[PDB]
Amino acid sequence: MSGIVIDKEKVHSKMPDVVKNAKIALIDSALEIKKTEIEAKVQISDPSKIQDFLNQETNTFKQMVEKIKKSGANVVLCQKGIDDVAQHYLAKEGIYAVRRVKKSDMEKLAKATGAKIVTDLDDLTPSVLGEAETVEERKIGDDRMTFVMGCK
């Protein structure tokens, strides 16, 4: 596809404007921390270990987020939200990230670029990535969208 338009913009300003030869990651699941799960770990914690836990979780999440960079990807389109700090990590890692991409677009992009839409970020092997000549921010009218061109 010498074109697929996504009506969603890259999440951070400090993110790349154009991405040449993009390996694209497709995640079904939100790049976020599960409330119920960390509340419970806080609840079952030894009172003197509360901060240890919050710190171990700050590391565990950042690691979950780095599995994108480590799988080689330089573009990530998430079907759901992306935690704000997670958005920071990717902006630093220089990755083009998009959140809340419609399910239809996720599938449309899956076929077009050849990626496999994962949910569990551990199955994020560099084989499930998609490819495209360029991925760019584009502003039509007052919408900031993302063009996925040269779909391979």
Residue that is written with structure tokens 């806080």 in the block: 42
Nearer to a copy of itself by Cβ, of 10 and 108: the residue is 10
Q: What are φ and ψ of residue 102, in 5° steps?
A: -55, 145
Nearer to a copy of itself by Cβ, of 81 and 114: the residue is 81
> Residue 7 touches which of Na ion, a copy of itself, none (CB < 5 to 8 A by kind)?
none
Mark the segment that binds Na ion (CB under 5 A) among 5-13, 50-58, 90-98, 101-109. 101-109
Interface with Na ion, residue 102, by CB under 5 A: no
Chosen residue from 2, 51, 104, 139 binding a copy of itself by CB under 8 A = 51
Interface with a copy of itself, residue 30, by CB under 8 A: yes
DSSP secondary structure string for all residues of 17-62: SEEEEEEEEEESS-BS--HHHHHHHHHTS-GGGHHHHHHHHHHHHH
Nearer to Na ion by Cβ, of 27 and 68: the residue is 27
> How many angstroms separate the CA atoms of 135 and 116, rounded?
18
Q: Read off the DSSP letter of residue 151.
A: -
> Residue 35 touches which of a copy of itself, Na ion, none (CB < 5 to 8 A by kind)?
a copy of itself
> 46-74 burial, b if ≥16 CB within 10 A, otherwise e?
eeeeeeebeeeeeeebeebbeebbebebb
- Please report which residue ranges of 71-148 form alpha helices under DSSP H: 84-92, 103-113
Interface with a copy of itself, residue 50, by CB under 8 A: yes
Q: How many residues bind a copy of itself (CB under 8 A)?
A: 26
Chosen residue from 83, 93, 131, 133 binding a copy of itself by CB under 8 A = 83
Contact residues for Na ion (CB under 5 A)?
103, 106
